[PDB]
RNA sequence: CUUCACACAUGCUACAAUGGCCGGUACAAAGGGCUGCGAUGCCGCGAGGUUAAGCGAAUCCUUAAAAGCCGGUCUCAGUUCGGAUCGGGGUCUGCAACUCGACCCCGUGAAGUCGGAGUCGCUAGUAAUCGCAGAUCAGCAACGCUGCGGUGAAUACGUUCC
């Protein structure tokens, strides 16, 4: 039972199990039950084969998932990177881009300490 | 040497979400196997930023 | 000005300066300290001097900074690693 | 009495005279062996490949693989002389066929984020090798009833004498390309 | 004035089941409002947009308090915990939002599984925890400050030691 990974953890609710799609999150499930017609308090342990093949379709007839959206992301980072912005040399930097503080914090786009 | 060293390998049935159906022998899966996708579906075997700008405003 | 109800936002002095020369050439380097004014898809091809605080840096606006601002292609601060 | 095979026998064999002016219906290119090796390299390392890899390789293809021992030893990969490191099965005849069609048909699509096989993995000669990454797209493996995972790469070796004749014959056999 | 190999200090959010999410439902005080508050209705998933009743106010708006109670689900997992970072798309204020604003939506889902030596506050409507309001203010304060209420403990033998 794959829709593009695997997506069938043990004993999960529908709802909750479609999230583990790259791509998707608690609202995009919760539209996806909707409109295909699954109800979310269900098990993807239950799920048949005609089920699996309607939500099949309607993902990539909509959403966009793992793999191209993968693509679609770096391909905007990059796309910064050597248009030459500031956000692109904060980028190529690896330092925060969305005008934060540098001076006692950003220890995720930084590492840990290097403790000079 | 073939006394009791390679597995069973015997005639299957593929059966595809699709439709398409044909069948070879294949290992221990005793007769069908049902899979979800194949040659006869799966895609590529099927086949602006002043655009943004100017749809924006 | 940053909401879908009243479009872009540009300087009139620097449309004014570029709407008068992209109709017959493009224009050389077009000194300016508007680094407020985003790019409109007209920009294409030219070159501004843009200010920095300290100096003003060429920028040549080519298919893809269209939708962003002239001060980001003009970096203000200098840090060089502290080593 | 593999479709493939039939297949082959019934449209590929003029085809490919039809596309390569071959004189002489001996001439013409056909699949003569199909390797699948793992290349495990927990060799030094708890020395596990009983069933990483023979007993998964046999659920693929239909026949035990042989083990195959380092031919001399490199400290980098703490490799000592004469100890298991790879595993390698060879596919041929009807088995090989079947192996081919069940590969092209039903396998080789099921990978996640495929967008199809190079076109360049030529030998050179006409031979040609590709990878994978796991124990998925063979149906005949369980994800259940399987430890760490592990690729594969396969050789598909032909009677053909260039890489031009080579691809020709694997696109008319069912090679997706790009 | 917002820099950033680092260091310190004060805080907020967490590391979950005395919990998270969903549905229903009860109970405050103290304040603010004409360059203002916008009830109602219509549009929008939402931030919001538009019309506009009333109101210099114990009469109008602010005004839905939240923890709480009932039911359902999750079943101990780096998770339906956590919400940093980043990608896309937007709203509003403002001549202007790149440096350098807040907020909304979709996606992304990091460290973190209770914290070394050490160190801080508190003796009762206190500590702990939950919301609300104001000043500054075009916008930025639901992490600061000054206040307001809700729920509501455990201990004190004693003066040897600091
Ligand atoms: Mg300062
Ligand atoms: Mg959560
Ligand atoms: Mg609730
Ligand atoms: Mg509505
Ligand atoms: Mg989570
Ligand atoms: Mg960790
Ligand atoms: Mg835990
Ligand atoms: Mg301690
Ligand atoms: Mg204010
Ligand atoms: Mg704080
Ligand atoms: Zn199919």
Redesign the interface.
Known sequence: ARLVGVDLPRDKRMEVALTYIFGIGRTRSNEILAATGIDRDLRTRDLTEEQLIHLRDYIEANLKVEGDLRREVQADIRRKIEIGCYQGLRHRRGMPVRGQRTKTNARTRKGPKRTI | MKSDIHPAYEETTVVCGCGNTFQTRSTKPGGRIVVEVCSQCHPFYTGGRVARFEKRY | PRSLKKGPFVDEHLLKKVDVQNEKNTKQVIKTWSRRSTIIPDFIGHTFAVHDGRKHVPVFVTESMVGHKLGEFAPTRTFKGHI | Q??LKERYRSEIRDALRKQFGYGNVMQIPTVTKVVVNMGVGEAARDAKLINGAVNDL???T???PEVRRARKSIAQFKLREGMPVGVRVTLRGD?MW?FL??L???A???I?????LSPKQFDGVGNYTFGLAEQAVF??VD?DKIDRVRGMDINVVTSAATDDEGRALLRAL?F?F?
């Open positions: 593999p479709r046999a659920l693929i239909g026949q035990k088995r079947e069609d069940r092209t048909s039903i080789l699509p099921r996640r984020d495929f967008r199809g149906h005949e994800v069912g997706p790009k």
